[PDB]
Amino acid sequence: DNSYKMDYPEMGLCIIINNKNFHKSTGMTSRSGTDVDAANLRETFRNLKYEVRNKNDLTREEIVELMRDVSKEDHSKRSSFVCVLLSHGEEGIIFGTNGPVDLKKITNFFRGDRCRSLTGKPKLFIIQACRGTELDCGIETKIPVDADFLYAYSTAPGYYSWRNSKDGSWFIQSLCAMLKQYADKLEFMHILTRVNRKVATEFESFSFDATFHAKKQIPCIVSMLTKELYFYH
Amino acid sequence: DNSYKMDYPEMGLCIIINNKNFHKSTGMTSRSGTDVDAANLRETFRNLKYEVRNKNDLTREEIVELMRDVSKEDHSKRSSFVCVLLSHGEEGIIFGTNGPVDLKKITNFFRGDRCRSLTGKPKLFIIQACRGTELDCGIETDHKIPVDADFLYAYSTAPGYYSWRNSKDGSWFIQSLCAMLKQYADKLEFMHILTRVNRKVATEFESFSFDATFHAKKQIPCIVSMLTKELYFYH
Numbered sequence: 001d002n003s004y005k006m007d008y009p010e011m012g013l014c015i016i017i018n019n020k021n022f023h024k025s026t027g028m029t030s031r032s033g034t035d036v037d038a039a040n041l042r043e044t045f046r047n048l049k050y051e052v053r054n055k056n057d058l059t060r061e062e063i064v065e066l067m068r069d070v071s072k073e074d075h076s077k078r079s080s081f082v083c084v085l086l087s088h089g090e091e092g093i094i095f096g097t098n099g100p101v102d103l104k105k106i107t108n109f110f111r112g113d114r115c116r117s118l119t120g121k122p123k124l125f126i127i128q129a130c131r132g133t134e135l136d137c138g139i140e141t142k143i144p145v146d147a148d149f150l151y152a153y154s155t156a157p158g159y160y161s162w163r164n165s166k167d168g169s170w171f172i173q174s175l176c177a178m179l180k181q182y183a184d185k186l187e188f189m190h191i192l193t194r195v196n197r198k199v200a201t202e203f204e205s206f207s208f209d210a211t212f213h214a215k216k217q218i219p220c221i222v223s224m225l226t227k228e229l230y231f232y233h
Numbered sequence: 234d235n236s237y238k239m240d241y242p243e244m245g246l247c248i249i250i251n252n253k254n255f256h257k258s259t260g261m262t263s264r265s266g267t268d269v270d271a272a273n274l275r276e277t278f279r280n281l282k283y284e285v286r287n288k289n290d291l292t293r294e295e296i297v298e299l300m301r302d303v304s305k306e307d308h309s310k311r312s313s314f315v316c317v318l319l320s321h322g323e324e325g326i327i328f329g330t331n332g333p334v335d336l337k338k339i340t341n342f343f344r345g346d347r348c349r350s351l352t353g354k355p356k357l358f359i360i361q362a363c364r365g366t367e368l369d370c371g372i373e374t375d376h377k378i379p380v381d382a383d384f385l386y387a388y389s390t391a392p393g394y395y396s397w398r399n400s401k402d403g404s405w406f407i408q409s410l411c412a413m414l415k416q417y418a419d420k421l422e423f424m425h426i427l428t429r430v431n432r433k434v435a436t437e438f439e440s441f442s443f444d445a446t447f448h449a450k451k452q453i454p455c456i457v458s459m460l461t462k463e464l465y466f467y468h
């Protein structure tokens with residue numbers, strides 16, 4: 001068929017790793033307002049009938065162990081899997097409270113051959129974290145083991161990722177608003193495309209210092225899905 | 234307006250870079266079956282009403298030059314822009330005949346601030362090249378806008394992975410891309426076309442080799458989208 005089977009007895013897990021406070025030896029700063037994103041996500045995915053588990057202030061080892069355990073659960077009665085990461089980042093990596101974790105390490109747990117009860121089911125990774133330090137100035141006007149993954153990144157490779165301490169990050173605030181409005185009408189890729197547009201046109205940084213002023217952001221959809229994804233029917 | 238305006242006088246250019254033969258100093262093999270891909274692409278994109286320009290066996294300098302020249306053209310009367318790269322590669326790199334070129338360097342020529350007549354229009358890069366040497370063993374079941382916006386990078390494989398070519402039929406990804414564009418360009422949104430491309434490659438293809446190391450290998454393409462709207466080839 002053209003569309004993933006989403007009529008399993010359960011939608012699936014939605015794990016949200018929310019890191020705000022970081023260890024002293026890291027020099028990493030606290031991500032103020034991240035709880036806004038975490039709460040917004042929790043409610044959005046609960047409304048999508050996901051079983052949501054929230055984690056807070058996990059270490060790199062704790063992140064690894066959480067994903068290992070979760071990958072070893074029996075997902076046979078679940079349609080999909082969602083993991084949302086809220087943290088500092090670097091290209092290809094997310095930060096535990098006490099140090100880096102390669103993203104590949106945690107998603108390898110769910111590879112078609114390592115988590116058999118999710119083989120052929122959509123595995124979604126939503127990543128609110130930096131991918132580098134670059135700023136966007138803007139401009140005027142048998143199946144493969146690596147299949148059935150989707151990575152919804154807040155930014156393009158190499159780029160910084162913008163957040164508002166009060167309103168939420170640009171990406172998650174837009175993701176939730178778009179899932180809320182369209183998760184009953186549009187296929188996921190088209191939801192995510194609405195997300196890009198909303199982040200691209202509605203947001204623009206403000207700074208008293210020109211270096212950080214009027215900067216822009218586009219999110220980055222990375223799809224290895226083999227079917228269309230509708231959260232209904 | 235949830236979709237790109239595709240009813241400009243022209244659909245736009247479709248530049249195809251087809252690298253078959255590489256200088257002896259590299260020690261890169263010839264890419265057998267690539268002319269099949271290049272011919273398939275040419276016919277497919279002409280049918281889509283794109284202005285195809287085929288270029289064969291370009292050097293790293295020539296690639297850069299071509300991309301520079303085309304980026305400096307006036308794309309005002311064009312709906313979009315397509316560029317297909319067929320060659321050897323590594324993560325983030327395609328090979329000219331004489332050596333490596335960073336993909337970022339070629340796609341940067343078209344960034345919303347360096348190519349004004351393409352601002353707000355979809356820039357499509359179709360990349361048939363290795364992104365490393367990993368092999369997928371498979372598993373059994375059988376206002377202002379950002380300058381990095383409006384780009385789509387359609388990769389033949391996942392990051393870190395080998396990309397499979399067949400001497401007779403061409404590459405698994407290009408073969409499959411042409412078939413689905415032929416079948417659905419008139420009906421489906423582009424992301425939906427590429428998703429079908431993904432399923433086709435993932436299910437219908439498996440490598441054959443007398444070397445068990447290279448036998449029974451699988452492949453999934455990788456769609457990287459910073460598009461802001463739905464793309465339909467027919468108005």
Ligand SMILES: O=C(CCC(=O)Nc1ccc2c(c1)C(=O)C(=O)NC2=O)Nc1cccc(OCCF)c1
Binds near residue numbers: 091135
């Ligand atoms: O640090 C970040 C994200 C931003 C951050 O937490 N601090 C930060 C540090 C320097 C700069 C910036 C942020 C900028 O936003 C910036 O515009 N320029 C910077 O020098 N990413 C990063 C940091 C160091 C290295 C890196 O990539 C190396 C791996 F190839 C990526």
